[PDB]
Amino acid sequence: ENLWVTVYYGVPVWKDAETTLFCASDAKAYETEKHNIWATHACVPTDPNPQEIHLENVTEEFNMWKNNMVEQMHTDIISLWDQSLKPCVKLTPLCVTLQCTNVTNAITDGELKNCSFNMTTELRDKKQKVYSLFYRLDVVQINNKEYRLINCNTSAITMVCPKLSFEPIPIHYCAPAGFAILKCKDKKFNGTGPCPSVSTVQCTHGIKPVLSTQLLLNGSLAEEEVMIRSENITNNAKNILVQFNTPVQINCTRPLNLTRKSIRIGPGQAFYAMGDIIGDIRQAHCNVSKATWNETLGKVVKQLRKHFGNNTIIRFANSSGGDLEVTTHSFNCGGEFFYCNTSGLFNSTWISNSNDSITLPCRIKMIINMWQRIGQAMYAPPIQGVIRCVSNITGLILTRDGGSTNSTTETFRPGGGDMRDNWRSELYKYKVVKIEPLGVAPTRCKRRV
Amino acid sequence: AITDGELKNCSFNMTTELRDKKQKVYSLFYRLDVVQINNK
Amino acid sequence: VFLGFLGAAGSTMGAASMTLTVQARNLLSGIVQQQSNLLRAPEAQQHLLKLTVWGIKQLQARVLAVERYLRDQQLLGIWGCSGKLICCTNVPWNSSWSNRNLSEIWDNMTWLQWDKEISNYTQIIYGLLEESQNQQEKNEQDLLALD
Numbered sequence: 247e248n249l250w251v252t253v254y255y256g257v258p259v260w261k262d263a264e265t266t267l268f269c270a271s272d273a274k275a276y277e278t279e280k281h282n283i284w285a286t287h288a289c290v291p292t293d294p295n296p297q298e299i300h301l302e303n304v305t306e307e308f309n310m311w312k313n314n315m316v317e318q319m320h321t322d323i324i325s326l327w328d329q330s331l332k333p334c335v336k337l338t339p340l341c342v343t344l345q346c347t348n349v350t351n352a353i354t355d356g357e358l359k360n361c362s363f364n365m366t367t368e369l370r371d372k373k374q375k376v377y378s379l380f381y382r383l384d385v386v387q388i389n390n391k392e393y394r395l396i397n398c399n400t401s402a403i404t405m406v407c408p409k410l411s412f413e414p415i416p417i418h419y420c421a422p423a424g425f426a427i428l429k430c431k432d433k434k435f436n437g438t439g440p441c442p443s444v445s446t447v448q449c450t451h452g453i454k455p456v457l458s459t460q461l462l463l464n465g466s467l468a469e470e471e472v473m474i475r476s477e478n479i480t481n482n483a484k485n486i487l488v489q490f491n492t493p494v495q496i497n498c499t500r501p502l503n504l505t506r507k508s509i510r511i512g513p514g515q516a517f518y519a520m521g522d523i524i525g526d527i528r529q530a531h532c533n534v535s536k537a538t539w540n541e542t543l544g545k546v547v548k549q550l551r552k553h554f555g556n557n558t559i560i561r562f563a564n565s566s567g568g569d570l571e572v573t574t575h576s577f578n579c580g581g582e583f584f585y586c587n588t589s590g591l592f593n594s595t596w597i598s599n600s601n602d603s604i605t606l607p608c609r610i611k612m613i614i615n616m617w618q619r620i621g622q623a624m625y626a627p628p629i630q631g632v633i634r635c636v637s638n639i640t641g642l643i644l645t646r647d648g649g650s651t652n653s654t655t656e657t658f659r660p661g662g663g664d665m666r667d668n669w670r671s672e673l674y675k676y677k678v679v680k681i682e683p684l685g686v687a688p689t690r691c692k693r694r695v
Numbered sequence: 696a697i698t699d700g701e702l703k704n705c706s707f708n709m710t711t712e713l714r715d716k717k718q719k720v721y722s723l724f725y726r727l728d729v730v731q732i733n734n735k
Numbered sequence: 736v737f738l739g740f741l742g743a744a745g746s747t748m749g750a751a752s753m754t755l756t757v758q759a760r761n762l763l764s765g766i767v768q769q770q771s772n773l774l775r776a777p778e779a780q781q782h783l784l785k786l787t788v789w790g791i792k793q794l795q796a797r798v799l800a801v802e803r804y805l806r807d808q809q810l811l812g813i814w815g816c817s818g819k820l821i822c823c824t825n826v827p828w829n830s831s832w833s834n835r836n837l838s839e840i841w842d843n844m845t846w847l848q849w850d851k852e853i854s855n856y857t858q859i860i861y862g863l864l865e866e867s868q869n870q871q872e873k874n875e876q877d878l879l880a881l882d
């Protein structure tokens with residue numbers, strides 16, 4: 247048939263693409279609100295009306311294990327902290343000798359230590375004795391006795407500004423013009439292959455950036471059942487992402503009361519430290535209910551057995567070593583940094599057939615090094631008053647041991663230190679596409695000479 | 696025994712980790728990069 | 736009916752050719768969500784550098800969206816049909832490019848799977864478009880003027 251090309255512009259076709267998205271946070275007046283590191287000078291106020299245009303007949307292939315949104319969220323998070331902490335004061339004078347001692351007179355199991363050191367007055371030629379109350383994790387020994395901080399060898403401990411506030415605030419990742427984001431709505435999506443229900447979205451829902459290990463706090467829930475999700479299930483070195491359909495609540499506190507000193511450093515730059523224990527010394531702890539935790543493990547075992555076998559025995563162990571960042575459960579709540587001992591949750595067997603809460607003891611330290619960069623460290627100023635937190639547990643990160651024996655007993659352990667498992671468990675249903683408007687098609691049109 | 700020297704061997708104080716304690720350190724500076732004030 | 740942006744992605748070539756103005760205005764004028772980059776009145780110092788490091792990353796996606804748009808609008812001016820969202824270019828459809836017959840294309844194929852078959856030949860289909868227009872503009876129109 248004798249036909250002639252016609253040219254169409256605006257035709258709805260796609261190619262897969264890679265690009266850099268928009269931070270796009272939510273916004274208010276914030277006239278008295280303290281500058282907040284997660285947003286401010288990075289984000290723009292959010293389209294208040296996302297439109298989820300449901301497509302017909304479209305079947306697209308997604309892959310959550312090769313996504314770039316997870317790979318640039320981990321790069322922005324380092325760049326959001328590293329750009330806020332340029333103006334902040336360095337704590338270089340505090341690398342001195344400390345005349346410290348115990349706080350109590352009768353040791354039961356101590357925690358705090360009471361120190362003494364010199365510090366400059368206003369005029370920088372006069373020296374005075376000042377004290378503070380440092381935790382014992384943040385103090386090491388030189389040789390009555392004389393102590394010093396944990397990192398005077400290599401690191402410059404940058405005091406986090408007091409006008410700052412670190413806090414989960416929902417970031418919406420948006421695409422600029424010429425790009426689009428596609429959302430899966432299939433409820434059985436294990437993470438790869440075709441998604442038979444696709445809808446274009448302007449901007450994703452608001453994920454709350456929380457940096458935790460071994461357990462996923464304030465996450466997004468499943469839809470019908472528990473969703474077990476991993477890459478190459480028979481491979482040991484791959485983590486196993488678990489996602490709940492119902493939240494499991496937690497209650498955390500620091501039950502001792504504290505105030506702040508105001509030991510100055512220089513003209514206009516002070517330093518905060520722990521001053522007094524107004525009350526009684528108590529250990530920080532967290533509660534998980536037991537009847538809800540024993541039923542939430544009744545579902546994770548149930549759908550592990552569809553991947554391994556019905557007649558197998560499924561057991562949970564606790565850990566096998568490492569630093570505090572990967573043997574325990576890390577938080578960021580209320581301005582302090584809790585590292586709770588979770589050897590009481592992950593301890594049971596399963597054999598294929600009211601109000602009593604599980605208490606979790608918990609440590610505190612205030613000189614943290616996040617991402618383990620060489621010669622860098624942070625410092626969290628103390629919070630005046632006791633701290634209270636309430637959170638949900640929506641998900642786990644297990645890992646499988648698997649040596650070469652013949653036994654029918656699998657053992658699953660919680661896993662820690664890689665932040666890309668926190669983000670890959672949230673942006674799994676997305677893909678960015680490119681919009682190519684020109685197209686050609688044969689017809690009977692003939693320009694008319 | 697001088698034939699025509701080039702390097703010089705020096706000594707000075709330098710702070711340890713704790714910035715209130717001073718120790719003796721040395722180095723080997725070229726003679727073009729060292730001038731005289733007034734052993735010596 | 737307008738279903739919104741990309742709503743006709745699963746429809747036929749016949750039924751999705753009704754919606755061509757949607758993917759054109761949202762190819763540029765979806766930037767109205769980016770003109771918020773003139774931000775609120777900033778405070779004093781302490782992160783004055785963070786204000787401009789994140790200012791370039793907002794502006795590379797503004798400029799890159801503009802200067803990828805003009806080179807696809809200009810290319811329609813080379814073929815002889817600028818402005819029109821539908822033009823006809825008077826180049827014979829060689830039957831080695833594709834297949835069946837005219838009528839199983841517009842009734843039960845989508846543009847996405849159509850684009851797959853003809854993507855292999857797109858640089859030679861774009862080759863004849865700039866040749867059947869040059870023969871008309873410099874030869875025919877200056878001859879039909881004086882004759």
Ligand SMILES: *[C@@H]1O[C@H](CO)[C@@H](O[C@@H]2O[C@H](CO)[C@@H](O[C@@H]3O[C@H](CO)[C@@H](O)[C@H](O[C@H]4O[C@H](CO)[C@@H](O)[C@H](O)[C@@H]4O)[C@@H]3O)[C@H](O)[C@H]2NC(C)=O)[C@H](O)[C@H]1NC(C)=O
Pocket residue numbers: 413414456463464577578579580635636637638
């Ligand atoms: C998981 O999500 C939960 C639910 O949102 C979240 O709990 C929230 O924690 C924040 C912690 O900042 C709470 O905010 C505080 O709430 C108390 C309640 O009395 C207020 O007093 C606080 O006001 C102070 O805020 C600053 C603290 O110094 C001061 O600058 C200020 O002047 C006030 O003194 C503050 O608003 C928030 O209320 C809860 N949410 C609920 C619903 O209770 C939890 O933190 C998340 N988990 C993790 C690990 O982040």
Ligand SMILES: *[C@@H]1O[C@H](CO)[C@@H](O[C@@H]2O[C@H](CO)[C@@H](O[C@@H]3O[C@H](CO)[C@@H](O)[C@H](O)[C@@H]3O)[C@H](O)[C@H]2NC(C)=O)[C@H](O)[C@H]1NC(C)=O
Pocket residue numbers: 436437438439476477478479
């Ligand atoms: C997540 O879901 C996807 C799809 O639901 C799973 O992909 C499926 O993987 C199995 C692996 O055995 C594929 O079966 C094999 O197919 C090949 C031919 O493609 C055949 O030679 C083999 O004998 C076997 O039948 C299956 O095709 C594939 N699904 C699709 C739609 O292609 C994936 O395994 C799931 N992930 C996990 C961890 O279970």
Ligand SMILES: *[C@@H]1O[C@H](CO)[C@@H](O[C@@H]2O[C@H](CO)[C@@H](O)[C@H](O)[C@H]2NC(C)=O)[C@H](O)[C@H]1NC(C)=O
Pocket residue numbers: 302303745746747843
């Ligand atoms: C998916 O595309 C089809 C085109 O094949 C749409 O139209 C249907 O076409 C079949 C076969 O031509 C008819 O039997 C149906 O009656 C058509 N649908 C309607 C509503 O008339 C179809 O509509 C598209 N899918 C959806 C969900 O709209």
Ligand SMILES: *[C@@H]1O[C@H](CO)[C@@H](O[C@@H]2O[C@H](CO)[C@@H](O)[C@H](O)[C@H]2NC(C)=O)[C@H](O)[C@H]1NC(C)=O
Pocket residue numbers: 347348353356
């Ligand atoms: C302050 O508390 C610490 C923590 O218990 C005490 O540390 C002891 O240090 C000695 C020194 O070698 C060790 O042999 C002990 O094992 C440590 N623990 C205990 C429980 O004795 C320290 O003794 C306390 N300070 C003073 C002055 O007694």
Ligand SMILES: *[C@@H]1O[C@H](CO)[C@@H](O[C@@H]2O[C@H](CO)[C@@H](O)[C@H](O)[C@H]2NC(C)=O)[C@H](O)[C@H]1NC(C)=O
Pocket residue numbers: 349360361362377522523
């Ligand atoms: C930590 O040690 C300091 C001194 O090293 C204690 O401060 C003293 O408290 C007594 C109260 O009986 C006062 O009479 C002294 O004048 C204080 N000394 C100074 C220099 O202020 C402080 O009480 C200790 N803290 C704890 C929790 O034991």
Ligand SMILES: *[C@@H]1O[C@H](CO)[C@@H](O[C@@H]2O[C@H](CO)[C@@H](O)[C@H](O)[C@H]2NC(C)=O)[C@H](O)[C@H]1NC(C)=O
Pocket residue numbers: 386394395396397398399
């Ligand atoms: C700074 O580093 C030195 C070297 O590691 C620490 O001193 C001790 O040095 C001996 C021999 O070099 C090691 O076997 C010890 O393990 C070191 N002790 C510790 C606690 O690491 C010194 O303590 C370090 N100082 C600080 C503040 O970390």
Ligand SMILES: *[C@@H]1O[C@H](CO)[C@@H](O[C@@H]2O[C@H](CO)[C@@H](O)[C@H](O)[C@H]2NC(C)=O)[C@H](O)[C@H]1NC(C)=O
Pocket residue numbers: 503504505524631632
């Ligand atoms: C923690 O300690 C502070 C004091 O440092 C307590 O605040 C006092 O509370 C009483 C009772 O309401 C008031 O009479 C005082 O005026 C308060 N003092 C200050 C400086 O504000 C606070 O209540 C304590 N927190 C807890 C939970 O016991």
Ligand SMILES: *[C@@H]1O[C@H](CO)[C@@H](O[C@@H]2O[C@H](CO)[C@@H](O)[C@H](O)[C@H]2NC(C)=O)[C@H](O)[C@H]1NC(C)=O
Pocket residue numbers: 495496497533534535603636
């Ligand atoms: C965590 O703390 C909350 C309180 O903030 C607890 O909620 C209360 O639970 C008791 C017992 O069921 C009820 O009588 C109260 O009415 C609840 N408070 C509210 C505001 O509804 C919750 O039980 C705690 N969770 C755990 C696991 O201990």
Ligand SMILES: *[C@@H]1O[C@H](CO)[C@@H](O[C@@H]2O[C@H](CO)[C@@H](O)[C@H](O)[C@H]2NC(C)=O)[C@H](O)[C@H]1NC(C)=O
Pocket residue numbers: 564565589593
């Ligand atoms: C849970 O983990 C802890 C440490 O993380 C293990 O504790 C050790 O238990 C053995 C007894 O088999 C003791 O000899 C060790 O001293 C303990 N370690 C420490 C650091 O104290 C424990 O075995 C694990 N399992 C259970 C079921 O508690």
Ligand SMILES: *[C@@H]1O[C@H](CO)[C@@H](O[C@@H]2O[C@H](CO)[C@@H](O)[C@H](O)[C@H]2NC(C)=O)[C@H](O)[C@H]1NC(C)=O
Pocket residue numbers: 587588589590
């Ligand atoms: C985490 O908690 C467990 C218990 O919940 C700790 O195990 C205890 O370890 C000490 C050290 O010898 C023993 O005296 C106790 O008998 C152990 N408890 C039980 C129930 O066996 C474990 O050590 C804690 N983790 C760390 C790192 O200390």
Ligand SMILES: *[C@@H]1O[C@H](CO)[C@@H](O[C@@H]2O[C@H](CO)[C@@H](O)[C@H](O)[C@H]2NC(C)=O)[C@H](O)[C@H]1NC(C)=O
Pocket residue numbers: 464493637638
């Ligand atoms: C943490 O979990 C609780 C329990 O789901 C959430 O609180 C609400 O609980 C009621 C139960 O009566 C549900 O119907 C609501 O859907 C829950 N959400 C809201 C927004 O009301 C609580 O919101 C969870 N925390 C977060 C941060 O989402």
Ligand SMILES: *[C@@H]1O[C@H](CO)[C@@H](O[C@@H]2O[C@H](CO)[C@@H](O)[C@H](O)[C@H]2NC(C)=O)[C@H](O)[C@H]1NC(C)=O
Pocket residue numbers: 697700
């Ligand atoms: C170290 O070497 C220098 C370089 O030769 C010697 O410098 C002499 O300094 C005296 C002082 O006035 C001059 O008069 C000489 O001309 C210099 N050169 C020579 C070759 O003598 C210096 O003497 C040497 N140090 C010592 C301690 O002898």
Ligand SMILES: *[C@@H]1O[C@H](CO)[C@@H](O[C@@H]2O[C@H](CO)[C@@H](O)[C@H](O)[C@H]2NC(C)=O)[C@H](O)[C@H]1NC(C)=O
Pocket residue numbers: 704705706721
């Ligand atoms: C530079 O001078 C230093 C001392 O000023 C010399 O170092 C001494 O070398 C001797 C070797 O015979 C050692 O016994 C001493 O302990 C060293 N002193 C110190 C402080 O380490 C060094 O050898 C000189 N360099 C040259 C090239 O002559």
Ligand SMILES: *[C@@H]1O[C@H](CO)[C@@H](O)[C@H](O)[C@H]1NC(C)=O
Pocket residue numbers: 540593594595
């Ligand atoms: C939880 O419940 C199951 C079934 O009722 C029971 O076998 C088990 O002992 C309980 N406790 C734990 C720690 O699994």
Ligand SMILES: *[C@@H]1O[C@H](CO)[C@@H](O)[C@H](O)[C@H]1NC(C)=O
Pocket residue numbers: 555556
């Ligand atoms: C395991 O149990 C499931 C439950 O329905 C069943 O479909 C499957 O056939 C069982 N497999 C074996 C090997 O018994």
Ligand SMILES: *[C@@H]1O[C@H](CO)[C@@H](O)[C@H](O)[C@H]1NC(C)=O
Pocket residue numbers: 589590593594
């Ligand atoms: C671990 O399990 C054993 C056996 O059920 C139990 O006796 C022990 O208390 C558990 N450990 C912790 C820390 O609760």
